[PDB]
Amino acid sequence: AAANDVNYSFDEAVSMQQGKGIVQTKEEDGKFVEANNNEIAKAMTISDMKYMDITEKVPMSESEVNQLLKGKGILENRGKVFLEAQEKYEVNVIYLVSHALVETGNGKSELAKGIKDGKKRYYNFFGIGAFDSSAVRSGKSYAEKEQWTSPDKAIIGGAKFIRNEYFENNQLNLYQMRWNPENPAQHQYASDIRWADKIAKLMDKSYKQFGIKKDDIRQTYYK
Numbered sequence: 001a002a003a004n005d006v007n008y009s010f011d012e013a014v015s016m017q018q019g020k021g022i023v024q025t026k027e028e029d030g031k032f033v034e035a036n037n038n039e040i041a042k043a044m045t046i047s048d049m050k051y052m053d054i055t056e057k058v059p060m061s062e063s064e065v066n067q068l069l070k071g072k073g074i075l076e077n078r079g080k081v082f083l084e085a086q087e088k089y090e091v092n093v094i095y096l097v098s099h100a101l102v103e104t105g106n107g108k109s110e111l112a113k114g115i116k117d118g119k120k121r122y123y124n125f126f127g128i129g130a131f132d133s134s135a136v137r138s139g140k141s142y143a144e145k146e147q148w149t150s151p152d153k154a155i156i157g158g159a160k161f162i163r164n165e166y167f168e169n170n171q172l173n174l175y176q177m178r179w180n181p182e183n184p185a186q187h188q189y190a191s192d193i194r195w196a197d198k199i200a201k202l203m204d205k206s207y208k209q210f211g212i213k214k215d216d217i218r219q220t221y222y223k
């Protein structure tokens with residue numbers, strides 16, 4: 001019956017995002033530092049790729065997706081699998097590619113080449129859970145738990161996670177994934193205050209490259 005997810009005033013949400021121990025980071029002078037309170041408040045202000053529903057699909061062929069992935073390292077020539085993910089889980093493939101490209105350094109980062117454990121290697125292209133050497137051997141790594149033992153398994157698995165844990169939790173766009181205005185400071189995808197902006201920028205370029213129509217835009221989150 002109750003389908004109202006507007007729960008907090010903006011000032012209430014800001015105070016929550018500024019709460020004790022909550023990690024909020026900003027890229028400065030070549031690396032990540034903790035964001036200050038003013039920066040957090042500014043980052044979460046509403047200004048529109050960041051506000052667009054990414055739980056719908058877009059008309060991109062495997063050829064078009066591989067065009068986007070050309071020259072993208074470990075992600076090059078994996079468009080078939082990104083589209084398997086889109087259709088299986090109803091995840092916007094432009095969003096999915098853009099998120100992967102941000103997180104993996106255009107597919108070229110050292111971490112994108114995975115983490116060794118025994119005879120296997122684990123991959124993670126979406127910043128999901130703990131992903132470093134210690135977590136993998138300790139077994140306390142989501143990528144290991146889900147057995148993302150290849151790049152293709154990491155693409156499909158990443159989409160599954162986003163659908164099941166975010167889209168099914170009513171976090172339908174980048175803003176909601178980052179700032180969870182229905183329940184501020186819980187279940188947020190990333191600590192980088194500009195996480196949504198980085199993904200949205202690549203999304204917008206790809207939308208304009210292929211002439212893709214935008215899905216629903218929502219700008220009301222707060223009382």
Ligand SMILES: CC(=O)N[C@@H]1[C@@H](O[C@H](C)C(=O)O)[C@H](O[C@@H]2O[C@H](CO)[C@@H](O)[C@H](O)[C@H]2NC(C)=O)[C@@H](CO)O[C@H]1O
Binds near residue numbers: 126128129185
């Ligand atoms: C996708 C991912 O793993 N993101 C990290 C994020 O975890 C989210 C919430 C997730 O598992 O989907 C993580 O957020 C913290 O997660 C711990 C559980 O691991 C929670 O106890 C904290 O409440 C979370 N904080 C917030 C604000 O949601 C953050 C922590 O910086 O890192 C993300 O990369």
Ligand SMILES: [Cl-]
Binds near residue numbers: 019021022
């Ligand atoms: Cl603190």
Ligand SMILES: [Cl-]
Binds near residue numbers: 021022
């Ligand atoms: Cl946190």
Ligand SMILES: [Cl-]
Binds near residue numbers: 061062063064
């Ligand atoms: Cl094609």
Ligand SMILES: [Cl-]
Binds near residue numbers: 108109110111
């Ligand atoms: Cl690197």
Ligand SMILES: [Cl-]
Binds near residue numbers: 103126
């Ligand atoms: Cl990420």
Ligand SMILES: [Cl-]
Binds near residue numbers: 128130140142143
């Ligand atoms: Cl984990």
Ligand SMILES: [Cl-]
Binds near residue numbers: 186
């Ligand atoms: Cl939540």
Ligand SMILES: [Cl-]
Binds near residue numbers: 043175193
């Ligand atoms: Cl944002």
Ligand SMILES: [Cl-]
């Ligand atoms: Cl334009």
Ligand SMILES: [Cl-]
Binds near residue numbers: 059211212213
């Ligand atoms: Cl379209």
Ligand SMILES: [Cl-]
Binds near residue numbers: 220221222223
């Ligand atoms: Cl609002």
